[PDB]
Design a protein around this ligand. Sequence first.
Ligand code: FEC
Ligand code: FEC
Ligand SMILES: [Fe+3]
Ligand SMILES: [Fe+3]
Ligand SMILES: [Fe+3]
Ligand SMILES: [Fe+3]
Ligand SMILES: [Fe+3]
Ligand SMILES: [Fe+3]
Ligand SMILES: [Fe+3]
Ligand SMILES: [Fe+3]
Ligand SMILES: [Fe+3]
Ligand SMILES: [Fe+3]
Ligand SMILES: [Fe+3]
Lengths: 170, 169, 170, 170, 170, 82
Amino acid sequence: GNREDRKAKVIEVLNKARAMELHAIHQYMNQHYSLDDMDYGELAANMKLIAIDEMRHAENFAERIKELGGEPTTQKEGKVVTGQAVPVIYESDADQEDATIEAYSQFLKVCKEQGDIVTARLFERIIEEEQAHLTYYENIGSHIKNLGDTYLAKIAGTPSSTGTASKGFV
Amino acid sequence: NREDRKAKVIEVLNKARAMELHAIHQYMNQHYSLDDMDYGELAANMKLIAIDEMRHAENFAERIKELGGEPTTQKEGKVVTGQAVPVIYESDADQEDATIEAYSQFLKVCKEQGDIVTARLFERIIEEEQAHLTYYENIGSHIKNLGDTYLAKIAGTPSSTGTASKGFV
Amino acid sequence: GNREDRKAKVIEVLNKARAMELHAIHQYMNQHYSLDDMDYGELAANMKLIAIDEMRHAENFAERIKELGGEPTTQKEGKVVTGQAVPVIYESDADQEDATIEAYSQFLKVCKEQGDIVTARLFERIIEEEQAHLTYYENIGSHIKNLGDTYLAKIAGTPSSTGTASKGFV
Amino acid sequence: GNREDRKAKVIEVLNKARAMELHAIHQYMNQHYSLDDMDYGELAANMKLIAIDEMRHAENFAERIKELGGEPTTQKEGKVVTGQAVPVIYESDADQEDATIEAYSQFLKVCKEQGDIVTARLFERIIEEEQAHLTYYENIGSHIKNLGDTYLAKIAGTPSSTGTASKGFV
Amino acid sequence: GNREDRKAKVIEVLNKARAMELHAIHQYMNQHYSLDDMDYGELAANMKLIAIDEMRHAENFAERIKELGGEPTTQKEGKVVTGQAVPVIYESDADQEDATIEAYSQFLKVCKEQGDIVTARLFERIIEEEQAHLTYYENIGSHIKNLGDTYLAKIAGTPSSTGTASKGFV
Amino acid sequence: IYESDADQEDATIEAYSQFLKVCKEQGDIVTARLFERIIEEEQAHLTYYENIGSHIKNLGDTYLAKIAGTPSSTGTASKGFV
Ligand code: FEC
Ligand code: FEC
Ligand SMILES: [Fe+3]
Ligand SMILES: [Fe+3]
Ligand SMILES: [Fe+3]
Ligand SMILES: [Fe+3]
Ligand SMILES: [Fe+3]
Ligand SMILES: [Fe+3]
Ligand SMILES: [Fe+3]
Ligand SMILES: [Fe+3]
Ligand SMILES: [Fe+3]
Ligand SMILES: [Fe+3]
Ligand SMILES: [Fe+3]
């Protein structure tokens, strides 16, 4: 395609990815709110830290969309599922991460076909992070299935802190 | 009637929370524009205010959970994009004023429902919303009275909001 | 081809890239001398710092050329334009960086086609640095376009320091 | 026997021991990859730490063989068993350690018979370390046997770190 | 092909790579024992440090295989040549590293064809380390060729230490 | 549920053994035989609760999936007045 054609094709997959991150942020934070309510500290903390990774993916996608002359979407891709039980959280989060990695690896092929090396590299780095998320969700899911409440009894009452309060305006 | 009272508070908490989710997306959309323009200082403060709204959304969600509700995931109203710089501050100033009005109403319900803990949460957040309002009012005024003279001062300034966000990876 | 052919094809695009770097070094330093003479310190400093990134690029390209048995070129690609006014400096530097990314992306392709993974990673790294340079030049060109002498008035008489004198022999 | 007769008999028990070490390295690292995959951090870490002792043993046997003028073998003794369940891992590793102590004690007797005091002291030191491995594996197999999933729930999700990465070349 | 098919084809080239690392570890350590015996310390030190790099590669390949649900091989590919003279050591090691880089670049392509970005990145990073190994071996070969016993006289009696002993279990 | 009930039955058998002893000291053979009979039934409860508790602790979800949706009938309705 011409210069504009290529930019538009990449801005499209970037916005698709961004909508996926916007979904994960609301989905993972919903789950964090449940986990925190159950007082499963370590689990709630790590869920919020992964959601913050997704916020940063969302931001990186938007920044690159701006670099290419586009407008960052404000809509999340899909619907947020609430009230999930603990076994369901980790099962569905692992599935979701695996799907994202499949999706982003195709998005990557698009960028390479449209000759956009900078965007392809963004996708490669974020796919490596999604892999870290997948592995985490799978490990929790497997202990829960194999060890049940014995494992959860260990997590009950642990600290849920994610560190010092974040940089804000006030 | 404990359950009527929890239900009516949870309803305004979810209302305020959806106003926070909209604000987060609205202010970050403007942040990306300001950053693209290379008006660093303005871009940095717009993201810092977005992060304040994230913290409001979270506090509202946690209280909703304490009251046995489900925190909403949907934002109230539409995000406006491609806003020009004068419109960003004018519209952010208007939305912050509308939020203080809305939350003072929500505060009222909390007090009527005998929910002191939630009333205090709204009072605290309202005073932060006033800090944001004042900020947006001041920037809008400078832009209106000094125009490009004020912007040349913002051009090229750093946009960093601090050290990278705590994460999982 | 055999090993020699594939190496020779990569040496050819590395030396074309290197020739483009040698050009950018002389073109950006020429502009640096003007910016400095005009006493727009921050602009002059950053133009020289970008010039030094290009020096490092030229060096990295020649090191890879050496690894593959080739000889690093000493000729620059193209003519250095002198006497440019400030708006023209940033307009043409952004065009030149954009063109470089275009070119290096093709070169990247050659590397992949010849099975040279180490050389492909070098171009990938360097293209991301060029993207940073592109953004900088676009950003300046936009302030000059939108704010003109009101913006340059803020830059007038700023420090032009790029730091302590670079390591030398004497 | 004669001087070279004596060296050769020692070199032979040394090469038998070294082949047992090469096997141990691959057998315990295999178990480590499984324990790690299962996310039993503390079990995975100590398993890798023991394999690294076996690496040191292999190396010390090889340095002594060179001293005696022999050639250190490069072939492991026996087959590596894969897919073992957790109890079989600790059951089989303890038997392997007990067997190694037995063989090594016989190798030690050969060194004394061949009047090789330095090599015998090498065996003495290593048998003491193998005794430390044996006790370890017997202890874990005993907890798994007595406490089962309750013990494993405790290890689930523990850190698997064995320290800072290897000294290496790059 | 299907998801399971795609994992199977990547697991196969990962086990091919790992078997090559297992060979390199035994090959390089074998040469390390000769150089140490010869009291060429700097050479013995670096050869062992490169062998530790290959250990880390084998480990990284094993971990990815596990992530993909495969079983890490325990067998090395090819025969370890022993009794090499010093010049033969560096010629063959250089030749061995270039061949590794050729093979790994092929394995990389399979990863890409199977849509496995995380595994392609793993190979990309290890190919860069192998290139550092290749340059090293080529440089020592050049010095032995160009300077002979003069260069060896320099290395004679040098420290052979690779630092502090590796944390282990005992 | 099963952890606590096992402990409860174990406590009951210990207490009733002590009560049985008081009956023997008061020369009340009929009452002691009553405790004897009921202690043997408490032992069957204890054994029941300990076995379930073990399966839950050790086998988790596969065990409960077997119990999910099974019949909960305890037989024909109790004799009553109506
Ligand atoms: C809470 C909460 C919400 C609401 C979730 C919900 O559904 O309730 C929540 C929602 C969002 C949403 C959307 C976005 C995406 C904005 C967009 O791209 O349109 C979104 C975007 C960002 N968040 Fe966010 N948030 N958020 C935190 C809390 C919450 N956040 C905390 C805490 C930190 C702390 C970071 C730190 O300390 O390093 C934090 C950081 C960021 C960064 C900072 C990136 C960086 O500089 O590295 C970006 C961008
Ligand atoms: C000696 C010796 C042998 C025997 C070879 C022979 O043929 O004699 C030897 C053999 C092996 C073999 C196989 C493997 C591959 C195992 C497998 O994946 O099946 C194998 C695997 C590893 N070794 Fe190994 N060794 N080895 C050292 C010495 C020796 N090593 C020293 C020293 C360190 C010190 C590490 C450090 O402090 O960084 C060290 C560390 C490692 C690590 C950990 C690296 C890391 O975490 O970064 C892994 C994995
Ligand atoms: Fe993400
Ligand atoms: Fe993710
Ligand atoms: Fe707010
Ligand atoms: Fe606000
Ligand atoms: Fe360059
Ligand atoms: Fe450049
Ligand atoms: Fe040993
Ligand atoms: Fe041992
Ligand atoms: Fe390697
Ligand atoms: Fe290598
Ligand atoms: Fe009972």
